[PDB]
């Protein structure tokens, strides 16, 4: 299960990276 | 299957990350 | 299949993320 | 083997990238 | 084939993302 | 083969992206 588990952990982190960048864009737009 | 579902979620997050960074670039350009 | 299609979409978004970050670096240098 | 090892290293780096971007978001919000 | 080609394109974009983020860190440290 | 080599290059670039983002976070926090 190691390859499937590593891909699921990359997908969880990718979602959190997208959300943090939406918050950064909003802060910079005022 | 789990590999395809994780890769589809990474592709959706990658498109959201690209859009947020294009908004950040435009804010910093004025 | 869906695995190859998701990886082609991640490659296309990665190139857009690289371009936006090069524009952010130039804006922060003036 | 080598695919699994490289994916485990990408997952660990992705979690640190997410954490750093949450810190950047919080800094700009406050 | 197309899976190896997409991963090679992701590798090149990742290197360009790392270059740009190092430029951004240096500009903010100025 | 070529799949493992591309993933090893992605892992190395991801570690440098994490480092650069921690530098950015520290600079912004002062």
Numbering used by the authors:
A (entry chain D), B (entry chain E), C (entry chain F), D (entry chain C), E (entry chain A), F (entry chain B): 1 to 30
What do the authors of the reporting publication say about this deposited model?
We introduced mutations at one or two of these sites to generate four groups of αHB: Group I had entirely hydrophobic interiors, but with different sizes and shapes of channel; Groups II and III had polar uncharged or polar charged residues, respectively, at specific points along the channel; and Group IV had aromatic residues installed in their channels.
αHBs are oligomers of 5 or more α-helical peptides that assemble into coiled-coil structures with central solvent-accessible channels. The αHBs are loaded with an environment sensitive dye (in this case, 1,6-diphenyl-1,3,5-hexatriene, DPH) that binds within the channels and fluoresces. Accordingly, challenging the array with analytes leads to differential displacement of the dye across the array to give a fluorescent fingerprint.
